[PDB]
C-alpha cells in the first residue's frame, strides 16, 4: 500500500475532507459515497472531475499530496463514509473513512 | 555504334516554379509553427488539470515544430536555383535537424496508432505510474532511433564557379549511398507506418463495432480518415522520388520534357510531403473534445 | 529525407568508370548516358574523361 | 449496463466461496472489473481486479494469492473466488467497473470505478 491519512474521521454545512498521501500521487485519487448497506457511488475521479449524476456541491482539488473533497452546503444524501482512494500506484489504497453524522 | 545528341534547352518556367515553391513553403512554415507551438503549450497545461496527457503528443508537436523551423534555409537556397550561400557547417546543422525531427514525428504517429489498441485492450487494470513510465521509455527510444537513422547523411554532406551544397558520398559507393538512403527514408517514412496505421485502425473499427457504448461517442469514418490522410500525404512524393530514380537508371527514355516533368513533380510533391507536419496536429489532437476545452482555457 | 538543394537536379548524381545519348543540360553541364547490356539499363559516364570531352566538342 | 451480485451466505472460516457479478450490457473485456469489500463498521479495502483481455489480474496485499478472480467474456460476468476464510473477510462485497471508451485517448483522464453493484453479504461465522 501507499498510505493515505484521511482526516477527520468524524464530521457533521461546510464540509471539507482533507486527504494526505504518503507519496506524490498525481491526480489518480477517487472519492466515494457508500450509503449504509449499499454499494459506493463515484463522486470524483482523477482529482477534480466529477462523475455524471454527481451534484455541483461536490468539488475536488489537488494541492500536491493534499487532495480534498468539498461540499459547500451539506445535503441529507451526504451522510456516508467517504473513502479517499489513490490509484496512481497500486495497490489501490483506501483511507480511514470519513463518517458524516 | 552511333552517338545521338539530345540538346536539352533551358525550361521556361523554372524561375516561376521556384517562386511558387517559396510561396507554398512560407504557408507551411506559418501554419506548422503556429499549430505545433499551441499544441505544446496546451499539452503542458493539460497535465496541470490532472489529465493523463500523452507524452507522445508533446513529442510529435516538438518534432513537427523543428521540421517546420528548418524551412527558411531551404527557401533561401532554393530561390538561387539551389545555390548555397551559407557555410558548410550551416549546411550540416540544418540538414541534421531537418532529418532527425522529420523521422521522429512520423515515428510518433506510429506509436499513437499502436497505443489506441493497447488502451482499449491491455491498459485498463495497469497502474497510472506504470503507463506513464512506458510512455517515457518509448519517448526516449524514438528520439534515439530518429537520431541514429539521420546521422550518416549529415556526415557526408559537404559544400561543393557556382556554389552549391550537395552531399558528396564516398568514391566507390556514391550510387549505393544515394539510392540506399532514399529507399530507407521511403520505407521508414511511409511503408512501415502506413502498415501499422492500417492494421490498428482496422482493429479499432472492429472493436468499436463490437461495442455499443463506444460507437455512440466514436465515429466509424474518422478512424479510416486517419488511414486515408496518411496515404494521401506520402504516396505521391515517394512515387516522384522513385520515378526520378528510374529516369537516372534510364528505364524511362530521356526527353527534355521528361526532365521538366520530373523537376515539376518532385518540387510539387515535396510541398505535399511538407504539408504532412501541418496536418499531424489536426488528426490526433484537434478532433478530441478534451483538447478543444484545454485549448480554450489556454487561449484566455 | 533530403531536400532538393542537397540533391540538385542533374541527369545523374553519380558516374560510372553501346549507344550513347548525350545530354547537353544547362544544369549540371554536359552529361553522357550509355547503354549497358546488363538489362538495357543506362547510366551516366564521367564528363571529365578525355576522349569523352573530345567527342563532345567534336559534336 | 447493470450489475447484480449472486453469492454470499454463511461459510465457516478456512472455507471457500464464490460470488458472481452478472453484467448485462457492455463488453467486459474493454473494461476492468474490480471488487471492493466493506468490512462491518470498518473502512473499504480493495480486493481484486481483472482485465479479461489478457487475463491480467491484480490483487490487494491482504487477499494476495489467497483470493482468485476469473472472468468470462462470452456472457459478461466476473467471479470472485475466495479461499482461506477469516473474520477479516467478513464484509459486504461489491463489484465495481472501471469503464473505458476509445473516443478520447490522447487527452484521456484517470477514471475511477463508476458502475457499482448492490452487493451480497458474506459472513464468516
Numbering used by the authors:
A (entry chain E): 2 to 13, 18 to 106
B (entry chain A): 27 to 186, 192 to 331
C (entry chain B): 0 to 16, 24 to 65
D (entry chain F): 5 to 129
Paper lines:
Given the extensive interactions of CID25 with both ACKR3 and CXCL12, we tested whether CID25 influenced the ligand pose by determining cryo-EM structures in its absence. We addressed these concerns by determining ACKR3 structures in the absence of either the extracellular or intracellular Fab. In these structures, the underlying conformations of ACKR3 and CXCL12 remained fundamentally the same, although the regions that bound to the Fabs became more dynamic. CXCL12LRHQ is a variant selected by phage display that has three amino acid substitutions at its N terminus along with a one-residue extension. It forms a more stable complex with ACKR3 than CXCL12 (12) and has a slower off-rate. In the orthosteric pocket, the backbone of CXCL12LRHQ aligns with CXCL12WT and makes many of the same receptor-chemokine interactions. The major difference is that CXCL12LRHQ-L0 packs in a hydrophobic pocket formed by the side chains of ACKR3-L1283.36, ACKR3-F1293.37, and ACKR3-S2165.43, which likely explains the slower dissociation of CXCL12LRHQ relative to CXCL12WT. The open, active state–like configuration of the intracellular cleft accommodates CDR-H3 of CID24, burying 2100 Å2 of accessible surface area.
In contrast, ACKR3 does not activate G proteins and is intrinsically β-arrestin biased. One of the best described functions of ACKR3 is “scavenging,” whereby it regulates extracellular concentrations of CXCL12 to shape chemokine gradients and maintain CXCR4 responsiveness by preventing overstimulation and down-regulation of the receptor. To address these questions, we used cryo–electron microscopy (cryo-EM) single-particle analysis to determine multiple unique structures of ACKR3 bound to a series of agonists: wild-type CXCL12 (CXCL12WT), CXCL12LRHQ (a higher-affinity variant of CXCL12 with alterations at its N terminus), and the small-molecule agonist CCX662 (13, 14).
